[PDB]
Amino acid sequence: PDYFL
Amino acid sequence: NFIIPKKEIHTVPDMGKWKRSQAYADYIGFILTLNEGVKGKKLTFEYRVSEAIEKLVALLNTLDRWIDETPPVDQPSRFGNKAYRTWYAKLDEEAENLVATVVPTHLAAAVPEVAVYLKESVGNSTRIDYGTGHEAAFAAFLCCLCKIGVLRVDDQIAIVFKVFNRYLEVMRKLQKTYRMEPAGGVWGLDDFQFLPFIWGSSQLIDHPYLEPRHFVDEKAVNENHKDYMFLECILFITEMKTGPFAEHSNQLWNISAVPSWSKVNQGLIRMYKAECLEKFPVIQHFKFGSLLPIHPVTS
Structure with a gap:
């Protein structure tokens, strides 16, 4: 859920 | 050799x-x-x-x-x-x-x-x-x-x-x-594939009208899939799966909210490294010879 920061 | x-x-x-x-x-x-x-x-x-x-x-x-x-x-x-x-x-x-x-x-x-x-x-x-x-x-x-x-x-x-x-x-x-x-x-990300989402998002960088939010729009996919690998993959999913997109493809649903294809591409590459290339159940089957050797990388 946190690869697109 | x-x-x-x-x-x-x-x-x-x-x-x-x-x-x-x-x-x-x-x-x-x-x-x-x-x-x-x-x-x-x-x-x-x-x-x-x-x-x-x-x-x-x-x-x-x-x-x-x-x-x-x-x-x-x-x-x-x-x-x-x-x-x-x-x-x-x-x-x-x-x-x-x-x-x-x-x-x-x-x-x-x-x-x-x-x-x-x-x-x-x-x-x-x-x-x-x-x-x-x-x-x-x-x-x-x-x-x-x-x-x-x-x-x-x-x-x-x-x-x-x-x-x-x-x-x-x-x-x-x-x-x-x-x-x-x-x-x-x-x-x-997907039942079967990964690479076409990376290369596909690259195709769509700086697209004049398609944004990531558009890939969950069936109309947008139907009108553009022939030009874009990413959209072709989405089309395959929506034909293979039933019901709301958010239910059957939660990761891709969340990716549609990424504002730019550029960030989609960057994020997918980070995900690929972590969820494919750093995943033991996958890498354990990778084979190494002379062309892709197991020896430490040369400088």
Whole structure:
């Protein structure tokens, strides 16, 4: 859920 | 000095060896090189089609024909169809012959090594399944052909837009026809593939009207899928799955809220490293020879 920061 | 590729990552602690390997460096470098090459381009882009590319397409067409000649069988099991094992046995016995149609005769010594990656690119006979590890083996196969000079720099766009594109069509046919199981959760990207989402998002960077939010719009996909690999993958999903997109493809649903394709591409590359290339259940089956070697990367 946190690869697109 | 070509070497038949073999497994080298046997236990979890071996993942360090993999991450430091020449193979890893060469593999991700290849993926990112193709990624840059297709940036901003449609599938209908006018590119060079070399003899090697044509032979690779012919190779995939042969695999395709074999599917037609090997229909599903009637069976009780509700998972993979046993006719896949018949199809796979044909590929297994013919892989070197097929590769020899692409590789020039003076490089015949490389055929057995290269063919191993082809044999690992189409799914698992025993489990009748397919995952990102098989897709990676196909990229590795193409990487090897570049390394020995069969494919050249001028072929890199065709590698994605023609060869890999055709490969995906054949894989989808295998997956549907033989009811193949996904090899790999709520945060999984796709049942079967990964690479086309990376290269596909690269195509769409700086697109004049399509934004990531548009890929969950069936109209947008229907009107544009022929030009865009990313959208073709979405179309496959929406045909294979029922109900709200958010329910069946939660990761991709959340990705549609990323404002730019550029960030989609960057994020997918980070996800690929973490969820495919740093995943032991996948990497344990990676094979290493002379072209993609297990030895530590050279400076």
